[PDB]
Design a protein around this motif. Structure first.
Motif, PDB file in Angstrom:
ATOM      1  N   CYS A   1      41.083  12.819  45.983  1.00  0.00           N
ATOM      2  CA  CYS A   1      40.441  13.778  46.934  1.00  0.00           C
ATOM      3  C   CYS A   1      41.152  15.133  46.873  1.00  0.00           C
ATOM      4  N   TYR A   2      40.591  16.083  46.166  1.00  0.00           N
ATOM      5  CA  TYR A   2      41.244  17.424  46.066  1.00  0.00           C
ATOM      6  C   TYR A   2      40.208  18.545  45.998  1.00  0.00           C
TER       7      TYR A   2
ATOM      8  N   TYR B   1      36.227  16.769  45.832  1.00  0.00           N
ATOM      9  CA  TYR B   1      35.560  15.478  46.159  1.00  0.00           C
ATOM     10  C   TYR B   1      36.504  14.333  45.823  1.00  0.00           C
ATOM     11  N   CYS B   2      36.033  13.117  45.888  1.00  0.00           N
ATOM     12  CA  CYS B   2      36.921  11.965  45.560  1.00  0.00           C
ATOM     13  C   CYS B   2      36.281  11.103  44.467  1.00  0.00           C
TER      14      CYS B   2
END
Length: 11
Positions: free
Chosen positions: A1-2, A10-11
């Motif tokens: 997740c960034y 997003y993840c």
């Protein structure tokens, strides 16, 4: 997740 400033957010 960034959330970078290129294409990550997003993840």
């Amino acid at each position: 997740c960034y959330c970078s400033l290129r294409g990550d957010c997003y993840c």
